[PDB]
Design a protein around this nucleic acid. Structure first.
Ligand SMILES: [Ca+2]
Ligand SMILES: [K+]
Ligand SMILES: [K+]
Ligand SMILES: [K+]
Length: 133
RNA sequence: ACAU
DNA sequence: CGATGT
């Protein structure tokens, strides 16, 4: 229906898919960048979106914030709900770094709790997510 | 088909 | 036009 303005929005950016992956989280209302991940040399769009949501969860928990997280990624939202990132990216020395981060993000989800609602950004109705690149 |  | 996903 309507945007929950008191929220954190995340977004992935990439150069290639697979290719260089980065992500950031922003205040949905103001656009203020709240966190930005150093670019990861090789990963997929969906791994980046997954890592972005999990980082937002950890960021909000550490700050005792009950704000929801918006993501436009059907895939990543489901991976977080499942606590399992079902990526097809091969595992090799080239992809070790992103797979390490993804493996660690799943481990974190399996060892911590949170009530943070994870919400679908309705691009069709609201336009591009505010964390856009 | 939908979400990227 | 290609790729990542449910
Ligand atoms: Ca975007
Ligand atoms: K996105
Ligand atoms: K983007
Ligand atoms: K497809």
């Amino acid at each position: 229906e309507e945007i929950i303005w008191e929220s954190l929005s995340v977004d992935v950016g990439s150069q290639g898919n697979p290719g260089i992956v980065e992500y950031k989280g922003v205040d949905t209302k103001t656009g203020e960048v709240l966190f930005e991940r150093e670019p990861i040399p090789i990963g997929t769009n969906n791994m980046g979106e997954f890592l972005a949501i999990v980082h937002g969860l950890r960021y909000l928990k550490e700050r005792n914030s009950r704000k929801p997280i918006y993501s436009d990624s059907q895939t990543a939202i489901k991976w977080v709900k499942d606590k399992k990132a079902k990526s097809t990216l091969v595992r090799n020395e080239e992809t070790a770094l992103i797979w390490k981060l993804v493996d660690e993000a799943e481990e974190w989800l399996n060892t911590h709790t949170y009530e943070t609602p994870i919400l679908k950004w309705q691009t069709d109705k609201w336009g591009e997510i505010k964390a856009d690149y």
